[PDB]
């Protein structure tokens, strides 16, 4: 029993404690990244069949992005795939849906990366791991690798009879007679409450518009703070660039023994609020 | 029939390998695996070691998905709503069912609150135990199911869990008792807590004290108080009302108890207001 030897390989990093109590409401899905995770069978295929003699490597993370888009598209277009798993759509029939797919609020993150005026790299939050930085966009991966990866994923989808590759919990089905099965769990029982009066609906409609405005005001303040920190990051990046250039100027200047023109080599105080 | 036997083989949660005791409705496909991995922060289950590795590289969560409502230098408590954190709470209930025989996973986790006790580390907050609680309990139960994880026994964690459940009830200005029939190990742990807090209250207060005044200070129901006094042989009946006194046994137990120097919940570090459900 007791200790597992590979723990330190699987659990790395540091959680920094804050003075005030943690405030958090993001879901597990919010903090996991791409929902598809390669198993041992996936990596041997990626190592030996895809990247064996490739000039352009498909990274493990890029692979999972592709499979994740395939899963989301099939669930949208073929919800009853298990009725006839071999009738699963081809890559070309599915490609229109993959192009429009909005994975993990990508369009929202892109808009935010635009609004900040950063446009540099990608919009990074606490929910993102730093290893995900190196990945290419989905549309580019679809063109270069889409059909090849889909051929592989398609077979795995057929093997599991149109269900999930990852083992799923057994949930109750509303047409099944049922049979006292201990593996069936987490049954759902809706609230079903009577409607409010029409007047209260109108009053709550007004409260809804008011709540929308307060969220808009909050987003403006939040965007301004993000802009403030973004330009602050640009400033320290300049101070780092100015430092390296100032040292190189002086060394070359000292080599050639030139005097004067020292205005840019020192800082000048100015009227700042 | 199937539910009356151990379901899974051997499980590695975080760095510790644990041995399940009872059936749990994990995906039946996992019963064919030698090892099952449980993520130490999300409680997510894995049959494949490679999927686990990929998951750990992308998982940024390092504590229970909710607000920290208590913190001392030994443990922290997180308050998690089953309706808001469905995936995480299901994972917790699946894990808990491995070590609780009579917990039901029949319905979804929405009607429960989960108070999760953690110990902090360089890596983050590691779940060591928890207790669930109905958002609205008809019988006034302040605990539904309560569990200390097997790898964290012999650390006094169970006592802290029980203390914290009553500290919430005291802040709620309610009396409370654990749900319905208690497990054998659960019944043992509550009787120990009930005796300890009763003898501690009686000795330190010194004066005579009413049943209702004891119920007011500890949030223990009169039922639990009376039964605790009967076991300690310090309850008597006079003029239609029950009375608790002190003897040589209670003063002796108190000295032994105070010598133990156990870890305790500090109510001043509980920053928490009762959730309001419409």
């Amino acid at each position: 029993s007791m200790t597992w030897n590979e723990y330190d390989k699987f659990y790395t990093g540091s959680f920094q404690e804050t003075t005030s109590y943690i405030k958090f409401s993001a879901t597990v899905e919010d903090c996991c990244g791409t929902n598809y995770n390669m198993d041992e069978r996936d990596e041997t295929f990626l190592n030996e069949q895809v990247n064996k003699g490739s000039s352009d490597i498909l990274t493990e993370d890029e692979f999972e992005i592709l499979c994740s888009s395939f899963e989301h598209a099939i669930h949208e277009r073929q919800p009853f795939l298990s009725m006839d798993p071999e009738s699963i759509l081809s890559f070309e029939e599915l490609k229109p849906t993959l192009i429009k797919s909005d994975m993990a609020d990508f369009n929202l993150r892109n808009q935010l990366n635009h609004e900040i005026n950063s446009h540099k790299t990608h919009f990074i939050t606490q929910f993102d791991p730093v290893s995900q930085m190196n990945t290419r966009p989905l549309i580019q991966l679809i063109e270069k690798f889409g059909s090849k990866i889909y051929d592989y994923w398609r077979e795995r989808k057929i093997e599991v009879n149109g269900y999930e590759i990852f083992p799923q919990l057994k949930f109750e089905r509303p047409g099944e007679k049922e049979e006292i099965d201990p593996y069936v769990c987490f049954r759902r029982r809706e609230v079903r409450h009577p409607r409010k009066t029409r007047r209260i609906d109108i009053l709550n409609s007004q409260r809804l518009r008011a709540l929308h405005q307060e969220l808009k005001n909050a987003k403006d303040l939040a965007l301004l703070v993000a802009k403030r920190e973004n330009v602050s990051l640009n400033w320290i990046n300049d101070e780092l660039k100015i430092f390296d250039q100032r040292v190189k100027i002086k060394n070359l200047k000292r080599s050639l023994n030139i005097s004067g023109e020292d205005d840019d080599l020192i800082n000048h105080k100015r009227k700042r609020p | 029939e199937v539910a009356r036997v151990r379901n899974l083989n051997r499980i590695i949660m975080g760095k510790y390998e644990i041995e399940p005791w009872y059936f749990s409705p994990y995906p039946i496909e996992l019963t064919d695996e030698d090892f099952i991995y449980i993520d130490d922060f999300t409680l997510q289950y894995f049959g494949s070691k490679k999927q686990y590795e990929r998951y750990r590289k992308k998982c940024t969560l390092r504590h229970p998905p909710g607000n920290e409502i208590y913190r001392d230098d030994y443990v922290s408590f997180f308050e998690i709503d089953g309706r808001k954190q469905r995936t995480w709470c299901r994972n917790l209930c699946l894990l808990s069912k491995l070590f609780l025989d009579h917990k039901t996973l029949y319905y979804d986790v929405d009607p429960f609150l989960f108070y999760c006790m953690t110990r902090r580390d360089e890596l983050g907050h590691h779940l060591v135990g928890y207790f669930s609680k109905e958002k609205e309990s008809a019988d006034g139960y302040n605990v539904a199911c309560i569990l200390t994880l097997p790898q964290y026994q012999r650390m006094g964690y169970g006592k802290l869990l029980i203390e914290f459940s009553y500290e919430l009830s005291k802040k709620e200005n309610k009396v409370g008792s654990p749900q319905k029939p208690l497990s054998d190990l659960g019944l043992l742990s509550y009787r120990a807590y009930w005796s300890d807090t009763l003898i501690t209250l009686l000795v330190e207060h010194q004066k005579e004290i009413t049943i209702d005044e004891i119920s007011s200070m500890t949030s223990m129901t009169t039922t639990d108080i009376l039964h605790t006094a009967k076991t300690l042989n310090i309850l008597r009946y006079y003029k239609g009302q029950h009375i608790i006194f002190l003897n040589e046994d209670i003063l002796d137990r108190y000295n032994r108890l105070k010598a133990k120097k156990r870890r305790t919940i500090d109510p001043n570090r509980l920053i928490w207001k009762p959730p309001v459900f419409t």
Binding site: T18, T19, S20, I22, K23, F24, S25, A26, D105, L108, R109, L112, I116, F123, I124, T125, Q126, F127, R195, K196, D201, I202, N204, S205, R207, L208, R209, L211, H212, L215, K216, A218, K219, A222, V225, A226, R228, E229, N230, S232, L233, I236, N237, E239, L240, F243, I249, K250, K253, R254, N257, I258, S259, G260, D262, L265, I266, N267 | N67, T278
Partner: protein, 119 residues
């Protein structure tokens, strides 16, 4: 479509948001305080280099130029680290509110497509 239901769901969804904004903003504030103290630490050393240049120029080397330059780059580098953290923190706050706002705007749109909510 039920506006009272949409309002109840939105209020529940956004219940913990003001607490998260305060929590994130004070971690930004606590980092900016550490950033300023580190700014003084490298600006004072950069002032010595600048004081020497005003008197003797850039051709003569400061008596401790190699030692100060290494200390300035070091302090400048941990400022960049602190500033990156504030950027990440500010991005999460913006991301949280932006995601709640889009969900509300989709709900408002669904209510407007019916006669239920007036545009």
């Amino acid at each position: 479509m039920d506006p009272s239901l949409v309002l109840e769901q939105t209020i529940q969804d956004v219940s913990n948001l003001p607490s998260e904004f305060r929590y994130l903003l004070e971690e930004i504030g606590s980092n900016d305080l550490k950033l300023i103290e580190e700014k003084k630490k490298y600006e004072q050393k950069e002032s010595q280099i600048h004081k020497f240049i005003r008197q003797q120029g850039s051709i003569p080397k400061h008596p401790q130029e190699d030692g100060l330059d290494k200390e300035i780059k070091e302090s400048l580098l941990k400022c960049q680290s602190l500033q990156r953290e504030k950027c990440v923190l500010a991005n999460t706050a913006l991301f949280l509110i932006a995601r709640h706002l889009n969900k509300l705007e989709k709900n408002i749109a669904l209510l407007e497509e019916d006669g239920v909510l007036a545009p």
